[PDB]
Design an enzyme around this catalytic site. Structure first.
Site, PDB file in Angstrom:
ATOM      1  N   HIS A  61       9.256  14.558   0.248  1.00 49.23           N
ATOM      2  CA  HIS A  61       8.843  13.382  -0.564  1.00 49.23           C
ATOM      3  C   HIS A  61       7.833  13.842  -1.619  1.00 49.23           C
ATOM      4  CE1 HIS A  61      10.777  11.016   2.583  1.00 49.23           C
ATOM      5  NE2 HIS A  61       9.943  11.563   3.489  1.00 49.23           N
ATOM      6  N   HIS A  91      -1.942  15.463  -1.652  1.00 48.67           N
ATOM      7  CA  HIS A  91      -0.565  15.628  -2.161  1.00 48.67           C
ATOM      8  C   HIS A  91      -0.544  15.073  -3.589  1.00 48.67           C
ATOM      9  CE1 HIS A  91      -0.727  11.566  -0.434  1.00 48.67           C
ATOM     10  NE2 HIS A  91       0.072  11.273  -1.494  1.00 48.67           N
ATOM     11  N   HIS A  93       2.013  13.043  -6.715  1.00 49.84           N
ATOM     12  CA  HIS A  93       3.206  12.378  -7.264  1.00 49.84           C
ATOM     13  C   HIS A  93       3.304  12.741  -8.746  1.00 49.84           C
ATOM     14  CE1 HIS A  93       3.034   9.657  -3.689  1.00 49.84           C
ATOM     15  NE2 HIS A  93       1.712   9.845  -3.850  1.00 49.84           N
ATOM     16  N   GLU A 103       1.136   6.786  -9.923  1.00 54.38           N
ATOM     17  CA  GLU A 103       1.447   5.557  -9.156  1.00 54.38           C
ATOM     18  C   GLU A 103       0.600   4.415  -9.715  1.00 54.38           C
ATOM     19  OE1 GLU A 103       1.518   6.730  -4.875  1.00 54.38           O
ATOM     20  OE2 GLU A 103       3.616   6.623  -5.419  1.00 54.38           O
ATOM     21  N   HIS A 116      -3.692  12.501  -4.681  1.00 51.42           N
ATOM     22  CA  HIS A 116      -4.211  11.647  -3.588  1.00 51.42           C
ATOM     23  C   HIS A 116      -4.877  12.543  -2.550  1.00 51.42           C
ATOM     24  CE1 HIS A 116      -1.123   8.311  -4.679  1.00 51.42           C
ATOM     25  NE2 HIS A 116      -2.230   8.300  -5.463  1.00 51.42           N
ATOM     26  N   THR A 195       1.300   4.224  -0.208  1.00 48.46           N
ATOM     27  CA  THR A 195       2.284   4.003  -1.302  1.00 48.46           C
ATOM     28  C   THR A 195       3.648   4.502  -0.841  1.00 48.46           C
ATOM     29  OG1 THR A 195       1.893   6.085  -2.377  1.00 48.46           O
ATOM     30  CG2 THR A 195       0.486   4.233  -3.079  1.00 48.46           C
ATOM     31  N   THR A 196       3.727   5.041   0.375  1.00 50.87           N
ATOM     32  CA  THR A 196       5.013   5.435   0.989  1.00 50.87           C
ATOM     33  C   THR A 196       5.087   4.753   2.342  1.00 50.87           C
ATOM     34  OG1 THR A 196       4.164   7.415   2.019  1.00 50.87           O
ATOM     35  CG2 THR A 196       5.038   7.699  -0.175  1.00 50.87           C
TER      36      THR A 196
HETATM   37 ZN   LIG Z   1       0.205   9.540  -2.444  1.00 52.25          ZN
END
Ligand SMILES: [Zn+2]
EC number: 4.2.1.1
Length: 256
Positions: A61, A91, A93, A103, A116, A195-196
Site C-alpha cells: 500500500h 510511511h 503517500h 492526502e 506520516h 486514512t487506510t
Molecule cells: Zn498515511
C-alpha cells in the site's frame, strides 16, 4: 483485498469498513479561511534524539520504516496532545505526477507526497490497544514539494530498489527521522482517523504548515515501487492517497 484501484479503492472501503462514512474521517481539506488561529495551542515537542530505526518495507500500500518503541526514544508531546506518544512507523503517500499525491490539501492544493509519522499514546500500553481509543494515536503529517533535495531522505531513497515489490523488507538501522522535518513546527490539528483500513477514528492529526522540499530524482524513486508481489502482474505504486473526507462537525485549529 482493499487498495487504490478502480475496483478496490476508497469508494469501496465502506463495504468492509463501514466507519469509512463516519463523523471523523481523514484526510480533510484544510481551508485557511476556517482553520482559525488558536493562541492557546502549545508548541509541538518532537524528541527524536534516541530514534532507533529497525526495518524498511513495502507493505503493498506504501513503504515505511519501523522503529524501536520499547522505551521513550522517539516521542511526540506538547502541541494539542496529552501525555506522550511513541513513534512506531513512518510511511509516505504520493502521486502519479508531481501535481498530486498528498492526502491532506490546503485550500484544495495537493502536494507531491505526504509523510506520516505514526505515534501511539503510552497510557494504553501498546499500539494495538491505543487504536481502539479516540485519543490513541498522534500522526504528524508533513507535505513534500519538489525542489532542492532533502539530504535526510537520501538514505531511504538509496534502498527502495531493494523493496520494489509487496512484502519485501530490509534491515534499516541508524536512520534519523529528524532529517525529514521542516524548519518550522507551526501546525494545524483536528481529530480524525487512519486514512487506510481499518479507518479507526483514533488519531489526533498534526499537519505541519511548512512542506519539506525533495528533488524530482528523490520522488521519481517512490514511483518505481510496485503494489504487486514478486512474480504477480506489475502494478506501479502511485496515487496511494485517500482524497479529502467531509469535515462534518469538526474544527481545524492553527497554532499560527
Ligand atoms: Zn498515511
Amino acid at each position: 483485498h482493499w487498495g487504490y484501484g478502480k475496483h478496490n479503492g476508497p469508494e469501496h472501503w465502506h463495504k468492509d469498513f463501514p466507519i469509512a462514512k463516519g463523523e471523523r474521517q481523514s484526510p480533510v481539506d484544510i481551508d485557511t479561511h476556517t482553520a482559525k488561529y488558536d493562541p492557546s495551542l502549545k508548541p509541538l515537542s518532537v524528541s527524536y534524539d534516541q530514534a532507533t530505526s529497525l526495518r524498511i518495507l513495502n507493505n503493498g500500500h506504501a513503504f515505511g520504516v519501523r522503529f524501536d518503541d520499547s522505551q521513550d526514544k522517539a516521542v511526540l508531546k506538547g502541541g494539542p496532545l496529552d501525555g506522550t506518544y511513541r513513534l512506531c512507523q513512518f510511511h509516505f503517500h504520493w502521486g502519479s505526477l508531481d501535481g498530486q499525491g498528498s492526502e491532506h490539501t490546503v485550500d484544495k492544493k495537493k502536494y507531491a507526497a505526504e509523510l506520516h509519522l505514526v505515534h501511539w499514546n503510552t497510557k494504553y500500553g501498546d499500539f494495538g490497544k491505543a487504536v481502539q481509543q479516540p485519543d490513541g494515536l498522534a500522526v504528524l503529517g508533513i507535505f513534500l514539494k519538489v525542489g532542492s533535495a532533502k539530504p535526510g531522505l537520501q538514505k531511504v531513497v538509496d534502498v527502495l530498489d531493494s523493496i520494489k515489490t509487496k512484502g519485501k523488507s530490509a534491515d534499516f538501522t541508524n536512520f534519523d527521522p529528524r532529517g525529514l522535518l521542516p524548519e518550522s513546527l507551526d501546525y494545524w490539528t483536528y481529530p480524525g482517523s487512519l486514512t487506510t483500513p481499518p479507518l479507526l477514528e483514533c488519531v489526533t492529526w498534526i499537519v505541519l504548515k511548512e512542506p519539506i522540499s525533495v528533488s524530482s530524482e528523490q520522488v521519481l524513486k517512490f514511483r518505481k515501487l510496485n503494489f504487486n508481489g514478486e512474480g504477480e502482474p506489475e502494478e506501479l505504486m502511485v496515487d496511494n492517497w485517500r482524497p479529502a473526507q467531509p469535515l462534518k462537525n469538526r474544527q481545524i485549529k492553527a497554532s499560527f
